[PDB]
Amino acid sequence: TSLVSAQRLGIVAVDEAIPLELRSRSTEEEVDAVILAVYRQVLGNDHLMSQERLTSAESLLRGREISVRDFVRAVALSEVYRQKFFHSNPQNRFIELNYKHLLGRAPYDQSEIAFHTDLYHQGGYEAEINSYIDSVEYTENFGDWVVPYFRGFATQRNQKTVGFSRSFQVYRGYATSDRSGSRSRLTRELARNTASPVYAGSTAESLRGTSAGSRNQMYRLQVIQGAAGTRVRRGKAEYLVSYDNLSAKLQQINRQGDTVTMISLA
Amino acid sequence: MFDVFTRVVSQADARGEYLSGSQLDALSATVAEGNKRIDSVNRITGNASAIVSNAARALFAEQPQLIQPGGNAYTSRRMAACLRDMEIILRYVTYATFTGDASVLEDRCLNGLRETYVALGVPGASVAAGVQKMKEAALDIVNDPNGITRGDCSAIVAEIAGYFDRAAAAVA
Amino acid sequence: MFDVFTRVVSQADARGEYLSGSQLDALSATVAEGNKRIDSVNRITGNASAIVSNAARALFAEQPQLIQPGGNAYTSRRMAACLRDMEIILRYVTYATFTGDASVLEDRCLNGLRETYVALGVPGASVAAGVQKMKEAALDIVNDPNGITRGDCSAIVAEIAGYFDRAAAAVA
Amino acid sequence: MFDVFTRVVSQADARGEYLSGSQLDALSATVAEGNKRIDSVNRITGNASAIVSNAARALFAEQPQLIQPGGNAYTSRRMAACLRDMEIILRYVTYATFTGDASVLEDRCLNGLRETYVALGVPGASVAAGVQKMKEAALDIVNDPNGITRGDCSAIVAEIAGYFDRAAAAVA
Amino acid sequence: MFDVFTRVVSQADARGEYLSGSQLDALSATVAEGNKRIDSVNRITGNASAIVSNAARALFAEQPQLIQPGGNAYTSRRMAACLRDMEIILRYVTYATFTGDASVLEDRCLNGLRETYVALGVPGASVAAGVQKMKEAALDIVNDPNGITRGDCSAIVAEIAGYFDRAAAAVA
Amino acid sequence: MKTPLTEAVSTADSQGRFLSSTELQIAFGRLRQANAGLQAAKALTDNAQSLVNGAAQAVYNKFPYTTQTQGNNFAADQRGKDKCARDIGYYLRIVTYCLVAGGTGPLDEYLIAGIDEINRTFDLSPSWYVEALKYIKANHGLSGDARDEANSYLDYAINALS
Amino acid sequence: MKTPLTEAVSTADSQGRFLSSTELQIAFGRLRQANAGLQAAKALTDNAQSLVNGAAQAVYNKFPYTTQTQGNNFAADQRGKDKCARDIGYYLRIVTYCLVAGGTGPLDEYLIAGIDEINRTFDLSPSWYVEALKYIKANHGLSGDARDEANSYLDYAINALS
Amino acid sequence: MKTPLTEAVSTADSQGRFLSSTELQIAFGRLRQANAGLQAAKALTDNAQSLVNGAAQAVYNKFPYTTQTQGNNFAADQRGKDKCARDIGYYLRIVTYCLVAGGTGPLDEYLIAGIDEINRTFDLSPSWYVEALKYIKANHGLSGDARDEANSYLDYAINALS
Ligand SMILES: *[C@@H](C)[C@H]1/C(=C/c2[nH]c(/C=C3N=C(/C=C4\NC(=O)C(CC)=C4C)C(C)=C\3CCC(=O)O)c(CCC(=O)O)c2C)NC(=O)[C@@H]1C
Ligand SMILES: *[C@@H](C)[C@H]1/C(=C/c2[nH]c(/C=C3N=C(/C=C4\NC(=O)C(CC)=C4C)C(C)=C\3CCC(=O)O)c(CCC(=O)O)c2C)NC(=O)[C@@H]1C
Ligand SMILES: *[C@@H](C)[C@H]1/C(=C/c2[nH]c(/C=C3N=C(/C=C4\NC(=O)C(CC)=C4C)C(C)=C\3CCC(=O)O)c(CCC(=O)O)c2C)NC(=O)[C@@H]1C
Ligand SMILES: *[C@@H](C)[C@H]1/C(=C/c2[nH]c(/C=C3N=C(/C=C4\NC(=O)C(CC)=C4C)C(C)=C\3CCC(=O)O)c(CCC(=O)O)c2C)NC(=O)[C@@H]1C
């Protein structure tokens, strides 16, 4: 997005990224750059050890035996990808990782989860991975020669608006990676077809003044609450409390039986 | 909240403009409808309990899954909450009618209601159905020609229908 | 994921220590149970389809609300998903039995499953009931003395029961 | 791709020898021409839209069959593509001028272009003619003596003319 | 890919026949060789780096043109690529030894390698020579009688030699 | 085909790794099993006709409508009885391949993949084949390791069909 | 963590399959090996100090410059000698893990992944560690399957360094 | 082959753009540098025999065991000294290319890419070449921009080796 919003949201570097295409008669440097970009994208920006590199697939790409899309698929099917993102993750976390890594977006609806859980149950891991790379969405955005890149922060034809808000759950900043498994932050909002506020970059910040206690820190607690006391006006609530009152607030929420969905510094 | 008059005022102040003759004339016409507005509010209010309970009974009859064990309206506590929500919505609809502006209904009642209902598992589409039943009963009551000076309330009745429709659309 | 061996290794490496003679003996004792472990895995696997379908039939007979129209297992897609979940849980329990460590079951199957079911409205208590039915049929299959070298499998059977119990706890 | 420098380096390395004194002197002469090369790239670039649109207009006037219904540049998508190709070729010509080596033009623009046009049914001979018209206007623009430090640019103009001739030949 | 067992299965299936007693006995004879097969894979694997590095030094000593400037193994990338290719071929020979069938080596490594090297300018004959040197050292390593239960590994050594010869013949 | 040795190499190849001790242990595991598998294959092969005939009759006994109803999918005529025996023979023969190969590879490759579509298209009940497979489990006469491996493949097919 | 049991499940999980005879055979291969692995681990563990000391000395002898030359990367002082003996001890300890685990997993994860970057950054020669590993091979005193497996891990580390 | 002129076009081409003032300014940057680079390349080239022999002896002095120890990787014989002298000459010659090209392109393409595997496979210490490159840095006699650009490439090679 434009500087005014991208700066607040921590996505300036994403906005200025340029799709990388492997051209005919590319140099050795250009192939090297492409291999690096694929590893960064498909492996979610993990530090890649030399022992983990796909020696053979790299050779074939460099020899123009296989396309960039073939090389993306080789990496996605590799044991490295499996160990990083599949063997230690629940399925729905695995699926959103595939959407981030391979399509550069967040899942749009629960039925995408259902489709891919069914496909894994039917044809296993390879069939699941191939669905992303062979999809119309992959072919029309990246084709055979362009390295995948994150798309979720830009208006895409045939996207859902909530794809933009959800992007911030799966993209956590430039200096981040999908390395620790874990659970999906998207589970509830996918299942119930809703959206969640975007607290990223500097949008989590809230004013302190003289009301933020001894450490001048506020914490934002997002809860789901019901009336099991004073009247509850909203099923979803946020509380801003200082560090000194944070234990009391948790205990209050806990005593009321309400669910904490997220807590972060404000 | 805004009423029919302050709504026009707020727009004019932002433009730095006196209200125009046409706008003043439009408000004059609103004033001429006042007695019929008042009567409609009084008629819905006077029948509020019947409207809510009949709509609720009709709703549960058509959607028995709501009150079967495990249903969202099952147990006294959830049945009570459900009846309260029906009353709440009807009440704010009457507020909007009284003020002649939807802002009270939108700000105080509908804003966030879909979000509340999804978060807590309340079947919004069933709330919408009940609202529609309350709409039909209230409009019948408003339109009843007995015991009232005869006249044409179609404009106020249309405005009231718009408020119920907003309420139904907001919960689903 | 860890197996019974690498579980001990990982703990030892974090402490910078060689495995103690006690730890090696305990692992040697694990090896001595290896054939029973394999037999239990083979037996459960050979009866997977019967185990899942029988438990599913019993579950729906015991809990008819699941398959009534509007129920969570009504419609072919949801019924198919339900049968799939039963099979998935059984499959990872066999994995954990095979490896002698729960990490595969916990990481791949149970982690976040409760939240998934709550989010979707899948009745986790019913899933737990289904798991319990699968467990009982599984352990009987494992313990059947017919057609196998006779011996005491009580330890393996207890370990397997622990995996089913962990699954049942997790979903509800 | 290569530039005028790395072209010499690459040949030197294959022979395992340092650049001769005359090769270094020759590159020094290339450096002495750097400002004129930069000016020519800037001048063509500044007039790119005019160069393309004028040559295209001249081409269609000279070759009306191209734009008649059924002609290859008929329909907006085909005309659009034709204009794009003219600009692509001009752009890569400037790249070659900037670097001082044809490798960029050959590798990234002209490689496969004849086969592309043959497969599409694009008349390659008409493309070559359009490239000739772009060449003509470009060299006049580069040689325009006004508003620029005076000097002899004939060498750079010859080098540019070669790149255009290379492009025209690759299609025709 | 095939292993020694599934190679026979696939042929039998193509004819719609059970394996004959002669075929099963042949397979049983292979089983008897299994320990020797495993030892040979282990020995080659344990010395893979030395086999490659010594074979490469010996090849560049006999064929110094490969490592002079402009030679095909000159520059670090080409030298590293050359050493990689040697290790890849050796790796696939151990796969074939391990499976007891040449398909993995042929399907994945050799099929198309000649054509690939021709297009790259890689001297296929020099590659074959290097494969020969690796073969000779590898067979000596397998045959080392020290530190192993003595026996006749002539059959397994002949098979391994055949795999090296396939590799050598496939490049030149 | 999926067998202990090819899967070992396939995994190693994808990692670009030489075979290590893990793969050697897989090979040893195959060797422990091979002779019993080869013995099971010979025993099933020798009694193939008896098993196939017996299994086919077991199906007819349990599903008598198959020999009484006219239709392309049933065995009321000699044509269907021959189809049926052939099919049961296929299951039996491919099971012996699995014992030779040491895995479900042959079943997956030649029979199981696509069987759902075949049975649906030609209106063949998978319950028929389950019964035939159960008969074979009950009559092949194997014991010990040979019995355990054979039954695992018979059950693998049975589970695939249900 | 490459290990026979984890590999078997990893593969089956990737395929979304129950464990089959292929994986059961893998488990048998492990069982055939495990006791020898544990015995080797015990023997290396009990002799840990002598093996590490001997190995470090064998390196110091083969590369005397490492004891004579100043620098953070050499063993001229006690600090460097400590670091060196510590490193060789890491190699030995993790090798015992491989014997317990039944695969190179522990070497892959704990030691080998990234070792190239460490040796280059801190200017440590792989040949030093190769000598240390050669000594351990020549002096662990193991025999039989314990020897074969332990050497496979010692050679795996050696090959990874060269 | 990274150089200012190719990088400018590569960037613009990736964006489908004509060259703009940005790329023009890169060219001016190249021009400002090119004459000093060409001067450095001549100076290095004319003294190459001395710099290479001097650098090699500096390696031999700093690492005397390289001239005393038998082994294919060491220079105790004439064969190794010729290999060592050749290798240092490669570094110097390719460095002069970087001065001609105005970037590290030549070092990246011809030398750096794959050097880790070579040194590891043939057991060559990168410290030897670091010392050789350090000798050249102190003995090429350049000043001004020729010194600064030339040292950047020698430093670039050193950082790649460390
Ligand atoms: C549509 C709403 C129906 C309708 C209404 C209607 N009402 C009037 C006029 C009046 N109604 C009142 C109301 C009240 N007087 C009171 O004391 C109270 C208690 C607080 C109330 C609610 C009044 C004061 C009037 C004005 C005097 C009169 O009696 O007429 C009209 C006539 C038009 C007007 O604006 O005066 C109308 C049309 N009539 C219908 O037929 C609809 C079913
Ligand atoms: C043939 C190409 C025509 C021609 C060219 C020409 N140019 C110069 C000299 C210069 N031109 C520039 C250019 C720029 N300065 C900037 O700041 C930018 C904007 C990004 C540009 C494009 C510069 C810096 C010089 C040097 C200073 C000067 O003005 O002299 C010359 C003179 C010789 C030289 O090589 O410098 C020439 C000949 N001259 C003609 O008559 C042709 C029509
Ligand atoms: C030709 C290859 C050489 C040769 C081999 C040979 N080996 C055996 C027997 C065995 N070898 C092993 C191997 C291993 N055991 C392990 O635990 C591991 C580490 C993972 C390995 C590699 C085993 C288990 C045996 C059987 C028991 C034994 O200790 O002997 C033989 C004997 C014949 C047989 O089939 O067993 C032979 C011949 N012998 C030579 O002389 C050749 C140089
Ligand atoms: C509790 C699980 C039941 C039980 C088990 C049990 N099994 C054994 C021994 C063995 N079981 C096997 C298994 C297989 N061999 C094969 O070839 C296959 C197919 C791949 C399988 C699954 C083996 C190899 C053995 C060892 C040889 C033997 O037949 O004895 C025992 C005996 C103890 C042991 O550890 O060996 C036992 C107790 N026994 C019961 O009574 C329970 C109902």
Ligand SMILES: *[C@H](C)[C@H]1/C(=C/c2[nH]c(/C=C3N=C(/C=C4\NC(=O)C(CC)=C4C)C(C)=C\3CCC(=O)O)c(CCC(=O)O)c2C)NC(=O)[C@@H]1C
């Ligand atoms: C115009 C009346 C107001 C305005 C608009 C504005 N919007 C954006 C950015 C986005 N708008 C959307 C919305 C959608 N994308 C979709 O795909 C869909 C349909 C499914 C919708 C509804 C999104 C996702 C974005 C962000 C991503 C993108 O920009 O492509 C901007 C740009 C903000 C920036 O900083 O770039 C603007 C300006 N702005 C006003 O001031 C008006 C009130």
Ligand SMILES: *[C@H](C)[C@H]1/C(=C/c2[nH]c(/C=C3N=C(/C=C4\NC(=O)C(CC)=C4C)C(C)=C\3CCC(=O)O)c(CCC(=O)O)c2C)NC(=O)[C@@H]1C
């Ligand atoms: C070293 C002084 C300290 C230390 C570091 C450490 N970091 C990680 C892991 C990661 N570091 C990063 C950071 C970046 N990645 C980027 O791309 C960028 C630039 C935009 C940065 C700054 C990331 C993303 C990771 C995670 C991904 C990955 O690990 O591959 C580790 C590894 C932790 C682990 O293995 O789990 C370590 C050790 N650790 C210390 O103890 C020092 C204080």
Ligand SMILES: *[C@H](C)[C@H]1/C(=C/c2[nH]c(/C=C3N=C(/C=C4\NC(=O)C(CC)=C4C)C(C)=C\3CCC(=O)O)c(CCC(=O)O)c2C)NC(=O)[C@@H]1C
């Ligand atoms: C029986 C003693 C007399 C009687 C009963 C009667 N009840 C209703 C309607 C309702 N009954 C309930 C009660 C409950 N719902 C709950 O969830 C629980 C807590 C677990 C209780 C106790 C409710 C909520 C209703 C209204 C909604 C519904 O119909 O379910 C009726 C019908 C009333 C109507 O208007 O439909 C009747 C007839 N009536 C008698 O005459 C009996 C003596």
Ligand SMILES: *[C@H](C)[C@H]1/C(=C/c2[nH]c(/C=C3N=C(/C=C4\NC(=O)C(CC)=C4C)C(C)=C\3CCC(=O)O)c(CCC(=O)O)c2C)NC(=O)[C@@H]1C
């Ligand atoms: C009845 C037709 C349906 C139904 C209702 C139902 N609602 C709730 C809970 C809440 N309803 C609200 C709504 C409001 N509260 C307010 O203060 C206002 C603003 C003026 C509104 C609009 C809220 C906030 C809640 C949550 C807090 C509370 O319960 O008071 C429930 C209970 C949910 C639960 O299980 O806790 C129910 C049952 N349920 C149905 O099945 C009908 C379709």
Ligand SMILES: *[C@H](C)[C@H]1/C(=C/c2[nH]c(/C=C3N=C(/C=C4\NC(=O)C(CC)=C4C)C(C)=C\3CCC(=O)O)c(CCC(=O)O)c2C)NC(=O)[C@@H]1C
């Ligand atoms: C009738 C033609 C024959 C027959 C029927 C029969 N069906 C079942 C069990 C089930 N039937 C279904 C079907 C559906 N569930 C759905 O949600 C929908 C889509 C909306 C369909 C079509 C299912 C899912 C079941 C299993 C679960 C359940 O019992 O609800 C049975 C019993 C099977 C069992 O094992 O219990 C029977 C008997 N049987 C005949 O013989 C008839 C010719």
Ligand SMILES: *[C@H](C)[C@H]1/C(=C/c2[nH]c(/C=C3N=C(/C=C4\NC(=O)C(CC)=C4C)C(C)=C\3CCC(=O)O)c(CCC(=O)O)c2C)NC(=O)[C@@H]1C
């Ligand atoms: C059956 C006894 C009960 C039941 C099940 C049920 N589950 C879902 C949906 C999901 N179940 C899972 C779980 C997994 N998927 C995996 O891949 C794995 C790991 C390998 C697990 C544990 C998931 C992820 C989903 C959501 C995605 C999907 O739909 O596939 C449903 C469907 C819910 C819906 O809204 O469609 C059902 C029906 N339901 C019952 O009523 C039984 C008690």
Ligand SMILES: *[C@H](C)[C@H]1/C(=C/c2[nH]c(/C=C3N=C(/C=C4\NC(=O)C(CC)=C4C)C(C)=C\3CCC(=O)O)c(CCC(=O)O)c2C)NC(=O)[C@@H]1C
């Ligand atoms: C008429 C309303 C005004 C007008 C027209 C005008 N057009 C051109 C030139 C072109 N017109 C087109 C348009 C099309 N070509 C197609 O193939 C199709 C789709 C089927 C369309 C709509 C094109 C492509 C050109 C350029 C090439 C050509 O000349 O054929 C001109 C001349 C422009 C020039 O520079 O020669 C004119 C004059 N001009 C007016 O002033 C009218 C008000």
Ligand SMILES: *[C@H](C)[C@H]1/C(=C/c2[nH]c(/C=C3N=C(/C=C4\NC(=O)C(CC)=C4C)C(C)=C\3CCC(=O)O)c(CCC(=O)O)c2C)NC(=O)[C@@H]1C
């Ligand atoms: C215009 C002077 C003439 C003309 C052109 C014309 N070209 C096309 C289509 C294509 N042109 C290219 C060429 C390139 N694409 C590249 O990326 C580059 C290298 C960077 C080049 C040189 C390609 C690939 C196509 C096909 C794909 C595409 O159009 O994007 C057309 C359209 C053909 C059609 O049938 O649509 C046309 C019309 N046609 C004339 O008549 C002029 C002589």
Ligand SMILES: *[C@H](C)[C@H]1/C(=C/c2[nH]c(/C=C3N=C(/C=C4\NC(=O)C(CC)=C4C)C(C)=C\3CCC(=O)O)c(CCC(=O)O)c2C)NC(=O)[C@@H]1C
């Ligand atoms: C070394 C003894 C000889 C030698 C080798 C050499 N090979 C290449 C380039 C390639 N080699 C391959 C082969 C494979 N890649 C794989 O992944 C596999 C397994 C499927 C094989 C068999 C390929 C594909 C290439 C091209 C791509 C790449 O460079 O990686 C080179 C490089 C040539 C060049 O860079 O131009 C070399 C030097 N060369 C000799 O002179 C020796 C005889």
Ligand SMILES: *[C@H](C)[C@H]1/C(=C/c2[nH]c(/C=C3N=C(/C=C4\NC(=O)C(CC)=C4C)C(C)=C\3CCC(=O)O)c(CCC(=O)O)c2C)NC(=O)[C@@H]1C
């Ligand atoms: C000198 C500082 C020390 C030394 C050198 C030495 N090097 C080798 C062998 C090789 N050197 C290289 C290096 C390159 N080859 C290239 O193409 C380039 C890029 C242009 C470089 C930098 C290579 C690839 C080899 C191996 C192949 C070959 O034999 O040429 C040796 C011999 C190693 C062997 O095992 O034969 C030696 C001796 N040795 C010392 O002791 C010096 C301190």
